[PDB]
Design a protein around this ligand. Structure first.
Ligand SMILES: Nc1ncnc2c1ncn2[C@@H]1O[C@H](CSCC[C@H](N)C(=O)O)[C@@H](O)[C@H]1O
Ligand code: NA
Length: 239
């Protein structure tokens, strides 16, 4: 133990994937961040040619996010389904980092996907069926009846189950999908507290810790590009 615990590596790798995704958003995009929360990705949006709408259901967290909100960011307090109905923005990129499993637990996965704007997207989602059993001093996922118990540091969150399989099958109806894991992250997070020496120390710990690789393998990433328009019947016409 020396600043190098399971929760520490997880947030750093999470920070790694957000750095790459936000950077890879096309220039001048109108972005929707579903679950903007307390504003961790503000500094990454602030240094970029992007118009961003951050939506959350928690006002207390959107209050922490306003205390240092970049001006290219607009904050709105409405969940995803209300906002998609009411908004006048046409979005060109969707971001959802550790957020979509909440709406997916109270909706049909095909309804969430068809309601998402038809635009490129990046999704980080925990797959609790790939995380159950992992018990480390700072990270633990355990089953509790129909609900999931997850402990980060000492935070004791309860999350509900969602249908990952149907979700992935619905994305395949709309998107070219490349699936991945946090374990596939190499790029150094933009977080300035993560020095080059510390990142190397984190990635070396991943190469030599089984528990860590399991935690990282259970945080599933989705790089989405919209399929061609239903006029894909022309290509099937080559059968
Ligand atoms: N249906 C919903 N619509 C929008 N935001 C939601 C939501 N359900 C939960 N959220 C928000 O999603 C967030 C996930 S945690 C914060 C995630 C943030 N993207 C980050 O990277 O730090 C929470 O703040 C939660 O309030
Ligand atoms: Na670019």
């Amino acid at each position: 133990k020396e600043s190098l615990t399971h929760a520490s590596v997880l947030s750093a790798y999470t920070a790694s994937y957000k750095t790459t995704a936000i950077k890879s958003i096309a220039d001048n995009a109108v972005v929707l961040d579903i679950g903007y929360g307390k504003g961790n990705d503000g500094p990454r949006y602030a240094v970029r040619p992007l118009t961003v709408t951050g939506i959350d259901t928690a006002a207390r967290m959107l209050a922490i996010a306003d205390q240092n909100k970049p001006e290219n960011v607009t904050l709105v307090k409405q969940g995803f389904f209300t906002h998609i109905t009411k908004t006048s923005n046409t979005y060109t990129h969707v971001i959802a980092f550790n957020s979509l499993h909440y709406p997916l637990a109270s909706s049909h996965p095909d309804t969430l996907v068809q309601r998402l704007p038809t635009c490129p997207a990046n999704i980080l989602i925990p797959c609790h069926h790939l995380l159950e059993g992992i018990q480390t001093p700072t990270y633990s996922v355990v089953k509790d009846e129909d609900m999931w118990c997850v402990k980060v540091t000492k935070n004791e969150f309860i999350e509900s189950s969602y249908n990952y399989d149907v979700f992935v099958k619905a994305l395949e109806s709309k998107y070219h999908v490349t699936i991945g894991s946090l374990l596939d992250c190499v790029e150094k997070p933009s977080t300035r507290s993560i020095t080059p020496t510390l990142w190397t120390a984190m990635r070396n710990f991943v190469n030599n810790d089984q528990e860590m690789q399991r935690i990282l393998s259970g945080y599933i990433t989705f790089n989405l590009t919209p399929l061609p328009p239903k006029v894909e019947i022309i290509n099937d016409w080559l059968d």
